[PDB]
Amino acid sequence: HMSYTWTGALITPCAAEESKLPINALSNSLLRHHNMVYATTSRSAGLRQKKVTFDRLQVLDDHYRDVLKEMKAKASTVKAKLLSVEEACKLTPPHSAKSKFGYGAKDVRNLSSKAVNHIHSVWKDLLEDTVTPIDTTIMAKNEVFCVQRKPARLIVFPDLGVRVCEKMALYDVVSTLPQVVMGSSYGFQYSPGQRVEFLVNTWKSKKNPMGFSYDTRCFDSTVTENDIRVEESIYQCCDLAPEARQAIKSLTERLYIGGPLTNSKGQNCGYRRCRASGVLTTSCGNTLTCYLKASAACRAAKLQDCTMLVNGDDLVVICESAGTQEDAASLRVFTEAMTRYSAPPGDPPQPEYDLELITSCSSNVSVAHDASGKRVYYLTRDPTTPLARAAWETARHTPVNSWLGNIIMYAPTLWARMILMTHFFSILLAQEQLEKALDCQIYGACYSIEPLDLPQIIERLHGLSAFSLHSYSPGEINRVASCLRKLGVPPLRVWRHRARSVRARLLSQGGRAATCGKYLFNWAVKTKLKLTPIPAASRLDLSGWFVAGYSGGDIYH
Ligand SMILES: COc1c(-c2nc3cc(NS(C)(=O)=O)ccc3o2)cc(-c2ccc[nH]c2=O)cc1C(C)(C)C
């Protein structure tokens, strides 16, 4: 029952890979300790292969089957539609990996006869054959981090024609089923502001609250054949078109359960018997399985009044405390149950008695004050990885602009406002690229966003207070200041000096640029302008921004 078997063939790159931080004329204005920033490359794929390869044993008890029966009762209320080839084509990212069969992502998006004809033949083969393993490509991800070096994470994905078929069969399922099955526990239905609100209300709902985050070691590799067949039985509870039922059974048998792994040079690398990290069902499958195992583990541990918050492989549990020592024993029982379910831990879970000390989705709740002096809870994170990635993005154009995603998701934070906004608006002004749409990812889905639209996006997700927050916590200020000294980033007083210049330069341009100056940088002036709702914000189609998670799902919105 191994997660993977290997031939010895290498996981090969597609292009030239850079590991050392690229340096340009802008680099030093952001970060001086260049040797601390690195990117992962295929050179470390061999080490990751060793980490992800292990035997999985599963012991399933009555708590497991009880929770599964409850989940299936809710899943039976879902009605899902089959997307047309055209609808599925339009969900494809413009820079999605080209097919092996003579067409790419732009051919798909343009509904080219060749792409559409190949997608129809892949679909027909899914209906007619429910046995043949489907080919997948295995790649090493190129991701940026700060030292203290991680080996490259791996991505496993089927061909472009298969990905369009996955959308046709399961896009509606993976978008609507998780919230129906898990209700308020489904994390991807919330904006960061709604996630904060859910965490605070849950913490308050408990007489003596205790909370913990549970880190499953290499989650995708812990997902067994049973787990993948169980996820399929959940999808099959939906009211579905006969062709969708057949395609879902086919995709589960031929792709989701496992299959051969091919490198970028066409060599057989081995065989996968665990979750594929680059399929449409990665996020939904991970969320459902994590929620199932954790809800059953909570019953086995006799945890009282358990509220879960699940996002793929990320899990937060808030419950009633039995006192510090009993909570510690309780958590070891929870961990034993998770382990029997084939979800052992990385770091052992730690009981927390302060909401602000729980780290989940690399984030924590913190408090600041709005213009009226009222306490405001918001989500923040250690800014090390956002800052290492901003330094890379200062000297290189990348497919996903992490700085833009981070300003969107962490707009109320002291570090996104003072550093990211200041640095990148300065760069965009110098290149007159404020109107240029840039790609970013929100809950794994790809978006093409113009930086000029940031005031309206921030207002809609976080409210006007995101432009007024002040009197940040001593703990939060200390973590930001320590991160700056560690990376060789100029102190906050420098960013404030720079922001006044960036603000003045934006206001000069007028129009949408002046709105960016006015709203994004009001924190930088001593005589603060009165901020009122932006008329353009109501018009924004913020559609399925926070409906579901799509990590590795090849989704463009
Ligand atoms: C929900 O938490 C997130 C997530 C997020 N996506 C996750 C996906 C997984 N697992 S998987 C691969 O199986 O799907 C686990 C934890 C995750 O956290 C992403 C961003 C995020 C941050 C910056 C840019 N784009 C983003 O999507 C921001 C938040 C916050 C701010 C709400 C905490």
From Swiss-Prot:
Domain RdRp catalytic: 209-327
Protein name: RNA-directed RNA polymerase
Post-translational modification: The N-terminus is phosphorylated by host PRK2/PKN2.
The reaction(s) this protein catalyses: RNA(n) + a ribonucleoside 5'-triphosphate = RNA(n+1) + diphosphate
Activity regulation behaviour: Activity is up-regulated by PRK2/PKN2-mediated phosphorylation.
Binding positions (Mg(2+) 2): D215, D313, D314
UniProt cofactor(s): Mg(2+)
